Design an enzyme around this catalytic site. Structure first.
Site, PDB file in Angstrom:
ATOM      1  N   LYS A 165     -12.700  -0.483   7.624  1.00 23.92           N
ATOM      2  CA  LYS A 165     -13.316  -1.357   6.644  1.00 23.92           C
ATOM      3  C   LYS A 165     -14.312  -2.327   7.256  1.00 23.92           C
ATOM      4  O   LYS A 165     -15.489  -2.312   6.873  1.00 23.92           O
ATOM      5  CB  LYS A 165     -12.216  -2.080   5.881  1.00 23.92           C
ATOM      6  CG  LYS A 165     -11.518  -1.191   4.842  1.00 23.92           C
ATOM      7  CD  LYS A 165     -10.348  -0.346   5.379  1.00 23.92           C
ATOM      8  CE  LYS A 165      -9.802   0.626   4.316  1.00 23.92           C
ATOM      9  NZ  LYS A 165      -8.338   1.057   4.663  1.00 23.92           N
ATOM     10  N   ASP A 177       0.416  -4.757  10.422  1.00 28.71           N
ATOM     11  CA  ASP A 177      -0.663  -3.888  10.068  1.00 28.71           C
ATOM     12  C   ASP A 177      -1.806  -4.705   9.490  1.00 28.71           C
ATOM     13  O   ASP A 177      -1.733  -5.216   8.350  1.00 28.71           O
ATOM     14  CB  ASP A 177      -0.201  -2.807   9.104  1.00 28.71           C
ATOM     15  CG  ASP A 177      -1.318  -1.846   8.732  1.00 28.71           C
ATOM     16  OD1 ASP A 177      -1.875  -1.174   9.639  1.00 28.71           O
ATOM     17  OD2 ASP A 177      -1.646  -1.774   7.540  1.00 28.71           O
ATOM     18  N   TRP A 183       0.843  -1.199   0.000  1.00 24.33           N
ATOM     19  CA  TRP A 183       0.000   0.000   0.000  1.00 24.33           C
ATOM     20  C   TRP A 183       0.877   1.247   0.000  1.00 24.33           C
ATOM     21  O   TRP A 183       1.783   1.378   0.845  1.00 24.33           O
ATOM     22  CB  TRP A 183      -0.939  -0.002   1.222  1.00 24.33           C
ATOM     23  CG  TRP A 183      -1.791   1.228   1.348  1.00 24.33           C
ATOM     24  CD1 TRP A 183      -2.396   1.913   0.331  1.00 24.33           C
ATOM     25  CD2 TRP A 183      -2.146   1.911   2.560  1.00 24.33           C
ATOM     26  NE1 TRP A 183      -3.092   2.989   0.830  1.00 24.33           N
ATOM     27  CE2 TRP A 183      -2.970   3.010   2.198  1.00 24.33           C
ATOM     28  CE3 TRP A 183      -1.860   1.702   3.917  1.00 24.33           C
ATOM     29  CZ2 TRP A 183      -3.513   3.911   3.160  1.00 24.33           C
ATOM     30  CZ3 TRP A 183      -2.379   2.604   4.871  1.00 24.33           C
ATOM     31  CH2 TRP A 183      -3.205   3.689   4.485  1.00 24.33           C
TER      32      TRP A 183
HETATM   33  C1  LIG Z   1      -6.904   1.392   5.059  1.00 28.82           C
HETATM   34  C2  LIG Z   1      -5.646   0.703   5.528  1.00 28.82           C
HETATM   35  C3  LIG Z   1      -5.005   1.023   6.756  1.00 28.82           C
HETATM   36  C4  LIG Z   1      -5.528   2.077   7.718  1.00 28.82           C
HETATM   37  O1  LIG Z   1      -6.047   3.237   7.034  1.00 28.82           O
HETATM   38  P1  LIG Z   1      -7.171   4.076   7.854  1.00 28.82           P
HETATM   39  O2  LIG Z   1      -8.139   4.716   6.875  1.00 28.82           O
HETATM   40  O3  LIG Z   1      -6.501   5.110   8.722  1.00 28.82           O
HETATM   41  O4  LIG Z   1      -7.927   3.130   8.755  1.00 28.82           O
HETATM   42  C5  LIG Z   1      -3.855   0.329   7.092  1.00 28.82           C
HETATM   43  N1  LIG Z   1      -3.318  -0.644   6.285  1.00 28.82           N
HETATM   44  C6  LIG Z   1      -3.907  -0.950   5.132  1.00 28.82           C
HETATM   45  C7  LIG Z   1      -3.319  -2.021   4.242  1.00 28.82           C
HETATM   46  C8  LIG Z   1      -5.072  -0.290   4.727  1.00 28.82           C
HETATM   47  O5  LIG Z   1      -5.660  -0.631   3.520  1.00 28.82           O
HETATM   48  O1  LIG Z   2      -5.799   1.167  -0.026  1.00 25.81           O
HETATM   49  C1  LIG Z   2      -6.685   1.986  -0.325  1.00 25.81           C
HETATM   50  O2  LIG Z   2      -6.617   2.632  -1.385  1.00 25.81           O
HETATM   51  C2  LIG Z   2      -7.844   2.177   0.597  1.00 25.81           C
HETATM   52  O3  LIG Z   2      -8.155   0.948   1.191  1.00 25.81           O
HETATM   53  C3  LIG Z   2      -7.501   3.168   1.684  1.00 25.81           C
HETATM   54  C4  LIG Z   2      -7.335   4.611   1.259  1.00 25.81           C
HETATM   55  C5  LIG Z   2      -7.654   5.007  -0.020  1.00 25.81           C
HETATM   56  C6  LIG Z   2      -7.490   6.329  -0.385  1.00 25.81           C
HETATM   57  C7  LIG Z   2      -7.009   7.256   0.519  1.00 25.81           C
HETATM   58  C8  LIG Z   2      -6.690   6.858   1.802  1.00 25.81           C
HETATM   59  C9  LIG Z   2      -6.851   5.536   2.167  1.00 25.81           C
END
Ligand SMILES: *Cc1c(COP(=O)(O)O)cnc(C)c1O
Ligand SMILES: O=C(O)[C@@H](O)Cc1ccccc1
Ligand SMILES: Cc1ncc(COP(=O)(O)O)c(C=O)c1O
Ligand SMILES: O=C(O)[C@@H](O)Cc1ccccc1
Ligand SMILES: [Mg+2]
Lengths: 398, 398
Positions: B246, B211, B130
């Protein structure tokens, strides 16, 4: 594994509240925390907020991510409040603004921006200042000193030394200023004094960072923002961290803004971008509920009018408690003059007790104030104001 | 004054989502963001949440500051989910837990704690990971590298190669690990593979930072936390950042947690202390509403049970969509095997389309995926399923 990890002393304020909460004195009163209470001593739910929150629960809606800047309503809300409804600077679009995680959050995003883009900039805070001011900036690896503000003898601002300090400071040094309601002293700058501080700031080519957590608790919304609106008209670049925690009575929801005043519309387009960036690497986006309450209240004419009203009331109760305290002291102690108590603004009073005196109010009375003597006037109501005032007399006579 | 400031580009996902908004195309589909959408393509309000929120709205209450570590119920909430109710480790009192501003907030506090106390520690994230993962750690001035993970030729994990890489890192180096539902590929470690990873981590004395943002979208609450719970037994010093965005469908409210597993009661106190210190210096306290929702849902047994079922529903829906996508693609394309689609877990899927192929999907169809090929399966429902798979066929056929 975690041998290196040092114990935390706690938030110096919360260290005191802990002592209070686990102390079972019958007569105990807490005046050591920057929280507004009403006459029953409870934290008020504002009427306008209550309405905002009923709109929100009707109906319960899906909860997408807010924009990293937070909701535009929030963002407009902060701006029109800090600068003026349809103010020229806003008309120009020379202010970059984000919703933040309260005032704290606003200072953090601000501080980080400064650490990164201006590594050579040092930051200066008032002597004394609020605890978290130093911690937040130092937490960004910003070198932090102090400018002399409070004068111990007079009980007012050491203005001569202060302006003199500001002369000895380099291009881009950061000045952490309180537009109103000094924390923790309560002693504010006069409108003439601000003009002097600002003209030095323009000349010495310094950076003013304004932390306004108590707008509407000094004199009124518009008057309280004087330092802000002036610096703007002087064409100065400025950082404004604002909080709705107290004036909106919404500490828990973490609502606030950061606003950055720029020479150019394009420069603002850039700064805004880096603000979103800074947010991205911190907490991603501000909380929805808090954002919505601000949006609803700031943008609903009637709710907004109603809000300004209830803040007026809170302010007034404080002003009034300052009076009754001065009354009971001047009555029972012929010697000293307590006009500083009614001169001081917002939620705080530096009651001018010695650290040993503050200790005495704690042991015998269950009356909690900070060692530097700060007292939250908002902790006082009809039902307990009597007891505190006498105890202060007894400690002053000693 | 701010001419040194460079424009921000925007969050690449948000740039893609922005691009999707401005699309003319009547049949546009957004598979580019990791939000769950139900069989109708709307973000859902969970029933358990609806119930929590109405409990909060009745009556509307005063809003004091949450403890810096968030509500104790929210912390108990997290710990029990991650480590399992009445976990030996929780009974021993050897986990320091704070509520955080979503998963992002947990990662930040986590990273910041590491930067402070392990300044020589470097951090390694999965190739690929990510996007935002790097930003947070670099945002702390922590140097960030990439450990081998995903193998392109096979579509699985370059496991053998990964383990050797871990043997080459220094004491207290940090590995950012997805316990399940790998973002962005969906290729996960097997339980066997995990034991080997943790063994090396033990032997090389590395810090495992887990995470977990999709608990219950892989297999189930227990299975998905397997890496977390194994880590614990081994006596490893674990960092777990859990998001509720989520699974609790509450992105906007910024609910997550951070948990640090310690050898001793004293190390847990020191770490808990410093975790507070870190939170104080960033944002001071977590938001009241999201905290209360979490507290309510997790610690009300009837609601906890209902919640879990509602997650598994979402899990099962994602799963049927993978099946249906595999099915259609296998039907119309030969010389490719599409088992990787069902071999993967959670919301994300490396779909194995070239950057040009993703480009064609946007251009003519208004189907939006990341250039690296990540697709959020949860943006698929029976209404668009056929349209998307056929579009994929066309792009793959040439
Ligand atoms: C969305 C996400 C998080 C945490 O993002 P938040 O919007 O602050 O909850 C952490 N790790 C992964 C892989 C995610 O997709
Ligand atoms: O990985 C992603 O794309 C989304 O799950 C989380 C996210 C998207 C966009 C902005 C912030 C956070
Ligand atoms: C002097 C001062 N500035 C700013 C703030 C902002 O804190 P919060 O996160 O509650 O907005 C506070 C809070 O007590 C404060 O006391
Ligand atoms: O000045 C004060 O007294 C409050 O800011 C103290 C405080 C702030 C934030 C959290 C807890 C306590
Ligand atoms: Mg830093």
């Amino acid at each position: 594994m975690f041998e290196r990890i040092d114990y935390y002393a706690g938030d110096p304020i919360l260290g005191l509240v802990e002592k209070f909460a686990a102390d079972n004195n019958p007569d105990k009163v807490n005046l050591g925390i920057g929280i507004y209470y009403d006459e029953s001593g409870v934290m008020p739910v504002l009427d306008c907020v209550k309405i905002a929150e009923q709109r929100i629960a009707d109906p319960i809606s899906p909860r997408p991510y807010l924009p990293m800047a937070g909701l535009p309503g929030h963002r407009k809300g902060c701006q029109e409040l800090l600068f003026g409804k349809d103010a020229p600077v806003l008309k120009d679009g020379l202010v970059a603004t984000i919703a933040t995680i309260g005032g704290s959050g606003a200072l953090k995003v601000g501080a980080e921006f400064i650490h990164e883009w201006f590594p050579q900039s040092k930051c200066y805070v008032s002597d004394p200042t609020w605890g978290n001011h130093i911690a937040i900036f130092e937490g960004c690896d910003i070198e932090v000193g102090k400018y002399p503000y409070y004068d111990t003898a007079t009980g007012g601002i050491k203005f001569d030394e202060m302006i003199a300090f500001f002369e000895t400071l380099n291009k881009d040094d950061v000045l952490l200023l309180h537009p109103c309601c000094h924390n923790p002293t309560g002693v504010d700058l006069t409108r003439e004094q601000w003009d002097t501080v600002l003209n030095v700031i323009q000349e010495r080519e310094l950076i003013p960072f304004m932390d306004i957590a108590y707008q509407g608790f000094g004199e009124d919304m518009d008057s309280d923002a004087y330092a802000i609106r002036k610096a703007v008209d002087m064409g100065l670049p400025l950082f404004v961290s604002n909080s709705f925690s107290k004036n909106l009575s919404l500490y828990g929801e973490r609502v606030g803004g950061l606003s950055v005043v720029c020479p150019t519309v394009d420069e603002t387009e850039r700064v805004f971008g880096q603000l979103n960036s800074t947010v991205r690497r911190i907490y991603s986006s501000p909380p929805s509920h808090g954002g919505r309450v601000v949006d609803i209240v700031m943008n609903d004419a009637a709710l907004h009018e109603q809000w300004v009203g209830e803040v007026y009331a809170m302010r007034d109760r404080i002003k009034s408690m300052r009076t009754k305290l001065k009354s009971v002291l001047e009555a029972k102690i012929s010697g000293r003059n307590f006009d500083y108590l009614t001169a001081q603004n917002g939620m705080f009073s530096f009651t001018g007790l010695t650290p040993e005196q503050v200790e005495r109010l704690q042991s015998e009375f269950g009356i909690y104030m900070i060692s530097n003597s700060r007292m939250c006037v908002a902790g006082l109501n009809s039902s307990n104001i009597d007891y505190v005032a006498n105890a202060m007399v007894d400690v002053l006579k000693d």
